[PDB]
Amino acid sequence: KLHRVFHYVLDNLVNVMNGYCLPDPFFSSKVKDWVERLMKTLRDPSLPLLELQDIMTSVSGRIPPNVEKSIKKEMAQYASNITSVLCQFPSQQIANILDSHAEVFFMNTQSIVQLVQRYRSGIRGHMKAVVMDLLRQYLRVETQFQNGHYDKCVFALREENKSDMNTVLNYIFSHAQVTKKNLLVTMLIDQLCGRDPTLTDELLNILTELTQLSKTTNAKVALRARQVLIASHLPSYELRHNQVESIFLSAIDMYGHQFCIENLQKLILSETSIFDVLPNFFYHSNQVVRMAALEVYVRRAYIAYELNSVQHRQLKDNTCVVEFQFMLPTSHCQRMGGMVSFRTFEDFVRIFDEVMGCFEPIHILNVAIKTDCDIEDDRLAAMFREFTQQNKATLVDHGIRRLTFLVAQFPKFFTFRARDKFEEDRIYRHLEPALAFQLELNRMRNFDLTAIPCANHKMHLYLGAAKVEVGTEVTDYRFFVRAIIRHSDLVTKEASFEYLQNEGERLLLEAMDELEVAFNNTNVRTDCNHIFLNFVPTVIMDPSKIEESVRSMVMRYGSRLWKLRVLQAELKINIRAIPIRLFLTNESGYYLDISLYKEVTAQIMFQAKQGPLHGMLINTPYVTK
Amino acid sequence: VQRYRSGIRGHMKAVVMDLLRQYLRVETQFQNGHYDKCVFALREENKSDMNTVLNYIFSHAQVTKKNLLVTMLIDQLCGRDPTLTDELLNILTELTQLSKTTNAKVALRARQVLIASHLPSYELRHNQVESIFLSAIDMYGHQFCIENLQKLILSETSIFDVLPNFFYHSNQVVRMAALEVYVRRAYIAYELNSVQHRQLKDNTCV
Numbered sequence: 001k002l003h004r005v006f007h008y009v010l011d012n013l014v015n016v017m018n019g020y021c022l023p024d025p026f027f028s029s030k031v032k033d034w035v036e037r038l039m040k041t042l043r044d045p046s047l048p049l050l051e052l053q054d055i056m057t058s059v060s061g062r063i064p065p066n067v068e069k070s071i072k073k074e075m076a077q078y079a080s081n082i083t084s085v086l087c088q089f090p091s092q093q094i095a096n097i098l099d100s101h102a103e104v105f106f107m108n109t110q111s112i113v114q115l116v117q118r119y120r121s122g123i124r125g126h127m128k129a130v131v132m133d134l135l136r137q138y139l140r141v142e143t144q145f146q147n148g149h150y151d152k153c154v155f156a157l158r159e160e161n162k163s164d165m166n167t168v169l170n171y172i173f174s175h176a177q178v179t180k181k182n183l184l185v186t187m188l189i190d191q192l193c194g195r196d197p198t199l200t201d202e203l204l205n206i207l208t209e210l211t212q213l214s215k216t217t218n219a220k221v222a223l224r225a226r227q228v229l230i231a232s233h234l235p236s237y238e239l240r241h242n243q244v245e246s247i248f249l250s251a252i253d254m255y256g257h258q259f260c261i262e263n264l265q266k267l268i269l270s271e272t273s274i275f276d277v278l279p280n281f282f283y284h285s286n287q288v289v290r291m292a293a294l295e296v297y298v299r300r301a302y303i304a305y306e307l308n309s310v311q312h313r314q315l316k317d318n319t320c321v322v323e324f325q326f327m328l329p330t331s332h333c334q335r336m337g338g339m340v341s342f343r344t345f346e347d348f349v350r351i352f353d354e355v356m357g358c359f360e361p362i363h364i365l366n367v368a369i370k371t372d373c374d375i376e377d378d379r380l381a382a383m384f385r386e387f388t389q390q391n392k393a394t395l396v397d398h399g400i401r402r403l404t405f406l407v408a409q410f411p412k413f414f415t416f417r418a419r420d421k422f423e424e425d426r427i428y429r430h431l432e433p434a435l436a437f438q439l440e441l442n443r444m445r446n447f448d449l450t451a452i453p454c455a456n457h458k459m460h461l462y463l464g465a466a467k468v469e470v471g472t473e474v475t476d477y478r479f480f481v482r483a484i485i486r487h488s489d490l491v492t493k494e495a496s497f498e499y500l501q502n503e504g505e506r507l508l509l510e511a512m513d514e515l516e517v518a519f520n521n522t523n524v525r526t527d528c529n530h531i532f533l534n535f536v537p538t539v540i541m542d543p544s545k546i547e548e549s550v551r552s553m554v555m556r557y558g559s560r561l562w563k564l565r566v567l568q569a570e571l572k573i574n575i576r577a578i579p580i581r582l583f584l585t586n587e588s589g590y591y592l593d594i595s596l597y598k599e600v601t602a603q604i605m606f607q608a609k610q611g612p613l614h615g616m617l618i619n620t621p622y623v624t625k
Numbered sequence: 626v627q628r629y630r631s632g633i634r635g636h637m638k639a640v641v642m643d644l645l646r647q648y649l650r651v652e653t654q655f656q657n658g659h660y661d662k663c664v665f666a667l668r669e670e671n672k673s674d675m676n677t678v679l680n681y682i683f684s685h686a687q688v689t690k691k692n693l694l695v696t697m698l699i700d701q702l703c704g705r706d707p708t709l710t711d712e713l714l715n716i717l718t719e720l721t722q723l724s725k726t727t728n729a730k731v732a733l734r735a736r737q738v739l740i741a742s743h744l745p746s747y748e749l750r751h752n753q754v755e756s757i758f759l760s761a762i763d764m765y766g767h768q769f770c771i772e773n774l775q776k777l778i779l780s781e782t783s784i785f786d787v788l789p790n791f792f793y794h795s796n797q798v799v800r801m802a803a804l805e806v807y808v809r810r811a812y813i814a815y816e817l818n819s820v821q822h823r824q825l826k827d828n829t830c831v
Binding site: 077080081083084085086122124195196198236238239242243245246250254256257258 | 631632633634706708749752755756759760764765766767768770771774798801802805817818819820821822
């Protein structure tokens with residue numbers, strides 16, 4: 001019966017994507033049932049047996065009983081023993097034996113050797129094959145289809161093959177129901193490529209061909225193509241919850257390995273961001289790894305500045321609070337800190353009174369909470385605000401510089417800065433001002449800015465609307481993208497140069513993935529796109545090999561720049577230690593001037609060489625050309 | 626600073642290690658032949674003076690106190706430390722050869738500890754297998770999983786415990802898989818021609 005489920009559902013589906021779909025409501029039902037029936041019979045490991053059944057019924061004669069009872073015995077074994085999760089049919093064995101007792105018979109039993117040849121890489125051999133085929137099937141047709149414009153392409157089809165038009169009529173009908181083909185392709189993609197971290201570098205070639213598809217209809221396909229194509233590059237979510245679990249409990253149950261500290265510096269100088277998963281366990285139950293993990297989160301947030309004192313507290317209804325004491329390295333002098341891990345806001349309201357019991361306001365205090373409830377961020381934080389205005393008693397208790405609330409599952413931050421400032425801060429809502437001087441966020445104060453949530457949270461993307469007065473309506477709409485890079489350091493002997501090229505290229509591909517998402521999404525005409533890079537290592541390379549490195553990069557990408565139309569990039573990187581703020585200057589055309597400065601006292605001043613825009617201060621709001 | 630290079634357990638290693646050689650040296654010269662001749666070998670090892678000898682004689686005189694207490698010391702530091710450092714075990718393997726009724730408790734604690742300091746790490750390999758299974762199992766979409774199960778079924782490492790914490794974890798694939806890996810790894814000697822998973826009315830897999 002499954003054999004019929006197969007031919008029926010498959011012919012229907014290849015007919016789906018041949019164009020024969022009818023534009024009516026029933027489509028969304030018919031194809032949906034059809035598709036699940038496919039997938040289900042595709043997981044069901046009785047397909048290959050039933051098709052070699054079906055051929056082996058039609059070659060009942062001409063038969064050597066040795067090879068038939070051999071293949072048929074051991075399939076029977078496979079059928080009884082199929083309730084194991086990992087059993088596949090003796091493919092290679094049957095091929096060898098057939099080739100041994102074999103060519104009249106060979107030319108009567110050909111269909112099986114080609115069946116087994118399709119069937120060598122398993123039932124997920126098929127899961128590869130079918131979608132891969134469909135992909136180039138879709139691909140050739142719809143890539144030739146919009147290789148310029150509909151008319152010219154159809155006229156080139158007419159004259160390249162003037163003699164016949166049947167391919168043309170099936171073509172015209174098919175891309176007539178293109179949106180149906182295309183939507184349903186997304187559907188198929190969604191429930192296979194929608195969640196599969198493993199993928200074999202054989203498909204991705206076709207996918208990178210597939211991403212270039214340039215039309216309004218192929219815009220879902222484009223965002224899924226990219227989101228999937230990257231997805232593999234941040235896998236194993238619960239796996240790294242397991243790896244950090246291991247590192248912490250093993251390293252810490254003795255906390256004297258001496259290699260624990262080496263792993264801890266790899267934890268606090270890990271290029272991969274673990275602010276995703278780290279919150280789920282730093283409120284597990286073992287007070288030491290609690291403490292360690294929690295302060296490691298602090299240390300990894302404001303990791304940029306220098307800390308000269310850190311004391312662990314352990315207080316009444318037991319709860320461990322840490323206190324910090326540090327100072328600024330020239331941001332704009334000293335301050336302390338507090339981290340507290342709490343389970344629910346209710347409890348916070350109860351155990352309040354000892355938290356300021358054991359506490360110019362010079363304290364930073366950030367509290368991590370779970371928040372798998374009170375789903376509305378606005379009733380949520382609104383309550384939080386009127387908690388501050390009901391009890392500023394915290395402020396009466398020797399004052400706090402800032403109180404940030406961290407609500408967990410990318411955690412939504414809720415920053416409340418105020419002794420005389422207005423309380424809740426909106427420029428910084430949904431983010432923790434860790435690196436905040438670094439993201440020079442006052443240099444965009446001439447703007448109305450919208451926090452956009454985004455994957456790969458390393459990569460923070462900002463939307464800029466030129467803020468103008470009521471008298472006139474805005475002309476500029478620029479994408480700013482500011483990223484973060486949290487690496488340890490690099491040793492010399494030219495290790496850095498290769499690193500710069502490879503990491504820059506990878507990050508740049510991520511950046512164009514983002515601006516691509518920006519095009520696909522609603523898009524409006526950006527002019528002066530921004531790239532922000534914080535290199536936190538300290539290489540000893542030269543400035544002029546930095547200039548060749550940025551030369552090789554920018555030169556390497558040509559048209560690509562002009563399509564995404566990226567106009568501004570800034571880095572710093574400390575070398576021998578001096579700082580060098582490189583700011584890139586390119587207008588229409590690919591001609592580019594590189595601006596290198598110096599930071600000099602008394603309000604610090606970017607000063608070149610000779611560099612354009614020599615003399616200005618640092619909080620320069622962004623020109624709205 | 627010279628004691629202080631290898632840390633706070635730089636000290637817990639170092640001091641006891643010294644004490645160990647103190648015990649070791651004394652009682653190794655003590656037993657080689659028989660008590661009298663050995664004391665005569667002491668006469669000639671330090672022919673000129675015998676004060677070291679008298680302190681020696683005094684020390685192994687109250688051996689049983691020393692001996693119990695050596696066991697004690699090992700017990701409340703090396704009583705549990707599968708973390709092993711390539712500096713003690715040399716002295717310890719010297720220590721294992723000690724061949725007398727008096728030096729008879731020390732041998733089983735020294736060795737039994739020194740052995741459980743070998744490969745297993747029960748909760749560590751429960752963690753490694755935790756990884757293998759959960760990593761392998763969200764879609765079993767690896768294909769190299771089969772290669773790792775054949776490494777389990779042709780595994781040098783012993784795995785034979787019961788693993789109660791996951792063997793009733795309620796996820797139908799790891800249910801089925803784990804149970805049959807137990808079957809297969811039990812009855813590995815014979816030839817298998819058929820295996821069916823069943824599924825009672827509620828939620829138990831046979």
